[PDB]
Ligand binder design. Structure first.
Ligand SMILES: OC[C@H]1O[C@@H](O[C@H]2[C@H](O)[C@@H](O)[C@H](O)O[C@@H]2CO)[C@H](O)[C@@H](O)[C@@H]1O
Ligand SMILES: [Ca+2]
Ligand SMILES: [Ca+2]
Ligand SMILES: [Cl-]
Ligand SMILES: [Cl-]
Ligand code: NA
Length: 130
């Protein structure tokens, strides 16, 4: 069912953010200090999509005050796959998993995330079949 899990800190390029220790399950790091304009590229780790169609994209997120949103896309900015609002979770290290669906073409993808509004932290992303 799982196509890929990508730890958010395992980006090949980024803008505007910093990693920090997470107390979420599994430990490790999350991406923090996210604001409008910031972005994360996973171009260095292309992900293979086996067939064209609907995929479920999950994000492990934390947000003290809510109000954030992101765009999931190809690295570089286009095509855009989808957008998602990031809810308040109650704290910077109070974690939850949110999800949406997007259409993806078959083949090798180089994904990216653009923050449209800040206020949240990101631990990992997961791409699943539907
Ligand atoms: O999709 C995220 C973000 O990508 C930015 O382009 C990056 C690209 O992600 C990276 O792999 C490449 O090496 O460098 C360029 C930046 O020069 C793009 O500028 C953003 O608009 C986009 O949101
Ligand atoms: Ca920032
Ligand atoms: Ca992580
Ligand atoms: Cl917390
Ligand atoms: Cl912001
Ligand atoms: Na696509």
């Amino acid at each position: 069912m799982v196509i890929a899990t990508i730890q958010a800190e395992d980006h090949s390029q980024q803008s505007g953010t910093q990693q920090e220790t997470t107390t979420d399950t599994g430990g490790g790091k999350n991406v923090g200090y996210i604001d409008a304009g910031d972005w994360l590229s996973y171009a260095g780790t292309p992900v293979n999509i086996p067939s064209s169609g609907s995929y479920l994209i999950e994000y492990r997120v934390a947000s003290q005050n809510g109000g954030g949103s992101l765009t999931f896309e190809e690295a570089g900015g286009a095509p855009v796959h989808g957008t998602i609002a990031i809810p308040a979770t109650g704290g910077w290290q109070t974690w939850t998993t949110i999800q949406h669906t997007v259409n993806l073409s078959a083949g090798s993808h180089q994904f990216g995330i653009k923050a449209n509004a800040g206020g949240w932290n990101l631990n990992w992303i997961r791409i699943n079949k539907t």
